[PDB]
Design an enzyme around this catalytic site. Structure first.
Site, PDB file in Angstrom:
ATOM      1  CG  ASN A  79      -5.890  -5.801   4.478  1.00  0.00           C
ATOM      2  OD1 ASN A  79      -6.124  -5.902   5.350  1.00  0.00           O
ATOM      3  ND2 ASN A  79      -4.895  -4.147   3.927  1.00  0.00           N
ATOM      4  CG  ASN A  84     -13.312  -3.409   6.654  1.00  0.00           C
ATOM      5  OD1 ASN A  84     -12.058  -3.527   5.857  1.00  0.00           O
ATOM      6  ND2 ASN A  84     -13.268  -1.862   5.580  1.00  0.00           N
ATOM      7  CB  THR A 115      -0.382  -0.105   0.847  1.00  0.00           C
ATOM      8  OG1 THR A 115      -1.595  -1.357   1.027  1.00  0.00           O
ATOM      9  CG2 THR A 115      -1.932   1.013   1.233  1.00  0.00           C
ATOM     10  CD  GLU A 156     -10.790 -17.280  29.904  1.00  0.00           C
ATOM     11  OE1 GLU A 156     -10.648 -19.153  30.715  1.00  0.00           O
ATOM     12  OE2 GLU A 156     -11.645 -16.793  30.035  1.00  0.00           O
TER      13      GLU A 156
END
Lengths: 48, 150
Positions: B55, B77, B28, B103
């Site tokens: 991605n 998304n 990107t 946890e």
């Protein structure tokens, strides 16, 4: 009538030695130091 | 910058993070390796663990698994949002086995520097396959271990 072989005025007389030449560049860099290293994700004493 | 000032001010409270982690062949931006490493030298000091996603992978989930022809950052998304709504479910919905934000730390993190896990979710398919697949627990388990699904 003989002019006495009259000379020019006024020429590129300041350029008669001129070329010109070129300067230099050299880049080229230094290595960083990564010698401060040790791992932590194991055992050096409790293995014994 | 922020990972530290949350240390200074909440002490022993949990810090988890959701990270897009950079791509193997895609970029990107040009300086991505500098920016990741710079952050990572702080992430080793302040985050308790970090949950990674790429991605480049979910694109290939879009092509193979989800079979949608032209994935946008939105088709991507709404894919991540199935990972977040799983991750938080014991905080929001009753269950047979709780798993908390604490946890994850105590089970994923054998040293406070080996604290970068990867995420996966499954199944991730359309109705074009979900009426042919049976979708038992063991199929869905196989479908998160599978290297083409990571």
């Amino acid at each position: 009538p003989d002019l006495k072989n009259v000379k020019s005025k006024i020429g590129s007389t300041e350029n008669l030695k001129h070329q010109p030449g070129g300067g230099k560049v050299q880049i080229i860099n230094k290595k960083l130091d990564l010698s401060n290293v040790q791992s932590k994700c194991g055992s050096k004493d409790n293995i014994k | 910058l922020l990972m530290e000032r949350l240390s200074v001010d909440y002490g022993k409270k949990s810090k988890l993070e959701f990270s897009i982690y950079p791509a193997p062949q895609v970029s990107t931006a040009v300086v991505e390796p500098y920016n990741s490493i710079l952050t990572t030298h702080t992430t080793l000091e302040h985050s308790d663990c970090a949950f990674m996603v790429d991605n480049e992978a979910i694109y290939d989930i879009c092509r193979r698994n989800l079979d949608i022809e032209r994935p946008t950052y939105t088709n991507l998304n709404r894919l991540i949002s199935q990972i977040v709504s799983s991750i938080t479910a014991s905080l929001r919905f009753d269950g047979a086995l709780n798993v908390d934000l604490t946890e994850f730390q105590t089970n994923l993190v054998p040293y406070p520097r080996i604290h970068f896990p990867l995420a996966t979710y499954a199944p991730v398919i359309s109705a074009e396959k979900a009426y042919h697949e049976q979708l038992s627990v063991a199929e869905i388990t196989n479908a998160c271990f599978e290297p083409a699904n990571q």
